[PDB]
Amino acid sequence: SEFKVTVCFGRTRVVVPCGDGRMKVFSLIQQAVTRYRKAVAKDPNYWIQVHRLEHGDGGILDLDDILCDVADDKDRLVAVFDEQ
Amino acid sequence: EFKVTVCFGRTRVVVPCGDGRMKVFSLIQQAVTRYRKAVAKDPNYWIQVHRLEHGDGGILDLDDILCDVADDKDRLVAVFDE
Secondary structure (H helix, E strand, O other): OOOOEEEEOEEEEEEEOOOEEEEEEEEHHHHHHHHHHHOOOOOOOEEEEEEEEEEEOOOEOOOOOEHHOOOOOOEEEEEEEEEE | OOEEEEEOOEEEEEEEEOOOEEEHHHHHHHHHHHHHHHHOOOOOOOOEEEEEEEEOEEEEOOOEEEEOOOOOOOOOEEEOOO
């Protein structure tokens, strides 16, 4: 479809297609990770743990909330996460 | 009639996409080719494009549909080596 967002892992930023927009925050989160994984490389025992997604505010998005209800098309969103 | 501009440094090239249903990697093939022509650097000259960004720095994944990840007439920056 049309609906899309960018997600900041640290300084690296990743565009995720959300077709609908009707996807739950937790679905989004995984989708963001997959792409980030691809963008960043590549260590044999790598791992990433996402704690939460936010607005630039620090406004915290509930995991079970529909995306288009909690954000707008083409919003920048930050991930609070760990990795390596 | 979907289309995008790709930025190779300061040179901007316009690529047609049909409907925009082509992958982000297809785009890159299209853009390299066109950019080669527009500056015609060398018979030997080699080029590698690492990633495609939006203005913000928003990476576009290679296996994603273009019209899904970008908008008609968007301006995109190529991150590349030459």
